[PDB]
Amino acid sequence: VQPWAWQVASLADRYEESFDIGAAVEPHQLNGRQGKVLKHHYNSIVAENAMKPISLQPEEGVFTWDGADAIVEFARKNNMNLRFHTLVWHNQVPDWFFLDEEGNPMVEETNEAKRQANKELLLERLETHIKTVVERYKDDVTAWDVVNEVVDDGTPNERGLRESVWYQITGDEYIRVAFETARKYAGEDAKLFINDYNTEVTPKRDHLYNLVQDLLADGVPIDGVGHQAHIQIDWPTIDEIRTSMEMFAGLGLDNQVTELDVSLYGWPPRPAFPTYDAIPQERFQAQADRYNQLFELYEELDADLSSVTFWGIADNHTWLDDRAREYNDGVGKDAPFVFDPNYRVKPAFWRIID
Ligand SMILES: [Mg+2]
Ligand code: NA
Numbered sequence: 001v002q003p004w005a006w007q008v009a010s011l012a013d014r015y016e017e018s019f020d021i022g023a024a025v026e027p028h029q030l031n032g033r034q035g036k037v038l039k040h041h042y043n044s045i046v047a048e049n050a051m052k053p054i055s056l057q058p059e060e061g062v063f064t065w066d067g068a069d070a071i072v073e074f075a076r077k078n079n080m081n082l083r084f085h086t087l088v089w090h091n092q093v094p095d096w097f098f099l100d101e102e103g104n105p106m107v108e109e110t111n112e113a114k115r116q117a118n119k120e121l122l123l124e125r126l127e128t129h130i131k132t133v134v135e136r137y138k139d140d141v142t143a144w145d146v147v148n149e150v151v152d153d154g155t156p157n158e159r160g161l162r163e164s165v166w167y168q169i170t171g172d173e174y175i176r177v178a179f180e181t182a183r184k185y186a187g188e189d190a191k192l193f194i195n196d197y198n199t200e201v202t203p204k205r206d207h208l209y210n211l212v213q214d215l216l217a218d219g220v221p222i223d224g225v226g227h228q229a230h231i232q233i234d235w236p237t238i239d240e241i242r243t244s245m246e247m248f249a250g251l252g253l254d255n256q257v258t259e260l261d262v263s264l265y266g267w268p269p270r271p272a273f274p275t276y277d278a279i280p281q282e283r284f285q286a287q288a289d290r291y292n293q294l295f296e297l298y299e300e301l302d303a304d305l306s307s308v309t310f311w312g313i314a315d316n317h318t319w320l321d322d323r324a325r326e327y328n329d330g331v332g333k334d335a336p337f338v339f340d341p342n343y344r345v346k347p348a349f350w351r352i353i354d
Contacts, residue, residue, distance in 0.1 A: 002344040005037045009353050012043040018302035020044040020081050022309030027070040033343050034313050044081035047071050052092040060096050072140045086145035087130050088178045090164035098165050106169050119170050127181045134185040145195040146182045147175050151208045160207025176220055183221040195226030195258055200236035200244045224254035232263050233290045238297055249304035259311035261336035262287055272324040272332030288347035295352040316341035
């Protein structure tokens with residue numbers, strides 16, 4: 001039996017010269033054992049869901065701030081930094097954004113002048129969303145995910161831009177406007193990130209690189225790249241991770257690791273173990289070596305890396321379980337963190353605290 005999380009050395013303290021140590025949270029976890037782990041180990045949080053666009057403006061002019069406020073309030077009381085996730089995304093985003101003034105989907109419109117008008121309306125709505133959220137949280141947020149996942153996994157067009165509805169209506173202008181608007185309202189000191197997953201692998205990595213270089217050339221205000229780091233034990237390689245961060249640092253950008261989790265499985269996640277208890281120790285050891293190498297690399301890059309956030313606290317709550325089930329007939333358990341479902345440490349903890 002391993003010790004409780006609150007009887008071991010603080011992760012935040014261990015890395016205080018290098019980077020913040022963060023966790024994604026839900027409002028209901030901000031007390032009890034999760035609250036205790038959070039206060040002991042972390043100096044940054046992010047909302048797993050409560051600050052996504054649908055979570056804040058489910059219908060036009062109707063803003064739902066409670067869950068988000070609870071998280072901001074907890075960060076404040078416990079002296080934690082706060083990443084904002086996220087101003088722009090193609091999921092968890094309200095349908096009303098993308099209807100013309102006659103209530104029809106803007107994508108269906110074929111008249112060129114009406115399409116132009118729909119583009120302008122959508123960008124107007126985006127600016128209003130951003131302006132309202134920023135005015136409310138600018139004094140609490142220390143990093144903004146201004147856009148999330150705007151780069152494709154394939155090459156449907158030459159720039160590798162995800163062809164979501166945002167793209168279909170505005171091309172790349174939604175991305176421009178999101179940064180310009182965020183900078184305008186949050187001030188020159190705000191830290192503005194473009195966030196994505198598989199930032200370590202090609203061609204995606206290159207599309208993202210080109211996008212940011214293009215945008216920086218046009219004077220669009222991007223301060224850094226958020227590497228979600230939804231990774232596995234052997235993939236991507238340590239070198240792939242390094243190369244990516246070094247590339248973005250070469251453009252004068254900061255890096256943050258934003259949603260770190262180290263799956264026990266590959267992709268797709270199968271065969272998955274059906275319960276936590278069924279998971280054999282070898283998996284936790286292999287994960288511990290992986291974590292050791294990750295955080296040695298992070299430390300090596302700490303001049304160009306300001307924050308590392310895990311996409312959760314302890315192994316009792318992780319979006320990876322949803323994915324494990326989805327590919328194992330509704331049954332499966334992943335275990336991505338350095339803390340177990342009971343908030344006792346796992347082998348990976350010892351290997352990143354030394
Ligand atoms: Mg170590
Ligand atoms: Na740093």
